[PDB]
UniProtKB/Swiss-Prot annotation, chains A, B:
It comes from Pseudomonas aeruginosa (strain ATCC 15692 / DSM 22644 / CIP 104116 / JCM 14847 / LMG 12228 / 1C / PRS 101 / PAO1). Homodimer. It catalyses: (2S)-2-amino-4-deoxychorismate + H2O = (5S,6S)-6-amino-5-hydroxycyclohexa-1,3-diene-1-carboxyate + pyruvate. It comes from the Bacteria. The gene is phzD1. The lineage of its organism: Bacteria, Pseudomonadati, Pseudomonadota, Gammaproteobacteria, Pseudomonadales. This is Phenazine biosynthesis protein PhzD1.
Amino acid sequence: MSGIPEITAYPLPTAQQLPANLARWSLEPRRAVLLVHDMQRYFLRPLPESLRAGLVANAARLRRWCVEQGVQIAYTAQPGSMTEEQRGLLKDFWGPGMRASPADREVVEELAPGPDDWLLTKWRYSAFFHSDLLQRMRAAGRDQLVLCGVYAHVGVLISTVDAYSNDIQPFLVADAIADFSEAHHRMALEYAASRCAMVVTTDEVLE
Amino acid sequence: MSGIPEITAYPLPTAQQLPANLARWSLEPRRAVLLVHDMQRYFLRPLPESLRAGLVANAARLRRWCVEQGVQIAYTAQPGSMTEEQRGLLKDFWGPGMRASPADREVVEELAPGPDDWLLTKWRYSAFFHSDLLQRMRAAGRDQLVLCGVYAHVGVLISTVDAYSNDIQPFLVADAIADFSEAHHRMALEYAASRCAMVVTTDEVLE
Ligand SMILES: CCCCCCCCO[C@@H]1O[C@H](CO)[C@@H](O)[C@H](O)[C@H]1O
Ligand SMILES: CCCCCCCCO[C@@H]1O[C@H](CO)[C@@H](O)[C@H](O)[C@H]1O
C-alpha cells in the first residue's frame, strides 16, 4: 500500500562525506527561496526517531537562518485523500496515499509555517508540477532554490532537476534531507553534485 | 568541456538481469508513442563501438515494430550552437554543448526519421521541457510512452519521470538505451522499475 519501505537508521552525511561539487554557484539570500519539501507527519512517521530528529533539527536551523537572512520560505504539501483521478499513476507505486486529516497532512510542528511563507499544493514528485512555484519565483525575482525535506532520491531530487532545468541554481542541503536508506541518500547526493545542484551541509549554509 | 566521461564497453542487460517491475502496465500500440531520445551523432560518438552497435541495432528493431504496429514515432534533438542564454545552467556541467552542424546534430542514419515522425527540439534533460510533446500526445489520444536512446540515467530517466508524472504509462526499453557505465545504466533501471516505468527488453516488446 504505501510504497515506502522499512527504513533503518543511518547517520546524516558530514561535509567530509559529500561528493565534490562540479558547479560553482554561491547562495545569495536576496536571490533565494527555501523549499521545505513534504515535511508532513505522514512522510516523517516511517523514519526511525534518531533519523527524524536529526533531520528536523537541521531543517529547523536552516529555516531560522533563512528567516534571519531574508530568504523566502516555501512549503510543499500533498492535500491528502486524493481522488482516483487526482492520484493517477501514483497509485501504482504508492497506494492511495495519505489522508486529508491533520494527523497525516500537517507540516511537523518544529517547522511550523509562518504567515509570510508560501504554501504549495503537492501533486507529483516535482514541487513545480501543477503548482505556481515557478511563477512565484519569477515574480519575486528569486532564481536560487535551497532544498530540504523528504525523500532525497524521489521528490527532493526531481524538484532539484526541475529547478535546474529552469535555470534556477539549486542548493541541496545534504543533512537536512532524509531517505529510504543511506545508499539512496548518497546516490541522490552524487547525482545532484554532478547533474543539477550544489550539495552543502546545514553548517556550510549558516557559514 | 562536454560533461561526458570516458565510457568503457559494457554488455546491455538481458531479461534475466532486469529489476522486477512493481507496476503492471501493458503496452498497447494504439495508445503509444515511441520516443527516440537524443540519438544524435554527437551523443553516440563517446560510446565504444561495441556499445553503439548494440544500442542502435535494438533501437532500430524497436522502431520497425513500432512502425509496423501503428505506434507514433517521435525524435528529440538539441538544436546545436545554443546561445549562452538558451544554454543556461547546462553550461556548468556540460559546456557549450554540440554544434548545429550535421556532424553533431543529425539523428544517426540507422534511425533516420520518416515524414510521419514527430520532431521535437530538445532543450533540457526532459523531452517534455519547453516542448509540445505533452500537447501532441494529448491531441493524438496517446497515453503511453516507449523510451529508447541516451543517456539512461539523465535525459531518458527524467523524460520517463515527466511522462509518469503526467499519468502517461512509460515503458523503458532496457537494451535500447545506453549510459556512462554499466552501474549508471543499472541504477536507472532500478529507479524506473520502482518509481516510474515498466522496464522491458526489446525482445519482450516485439513479444
Ligand atoms: C538512477 C541514477 C543513478 C546514478 C547515480 C550517480 C549519478 C552521478 O554519477 C557520477 O557520474 C560521474 C560521471 O559523469 C562520475 O565521475 C561520478 O564519480 C559519479 O558520482
Ligand atoms: C540517485 C537515485 C539513486 C537510487 C537508485 C535506486 C532507486 C530504486 O531503489 C529501489 O528501492 C526499493 C525500495 O523503495 C528497493 O526495494 C529496491 O531494491 C531498490 O532497487
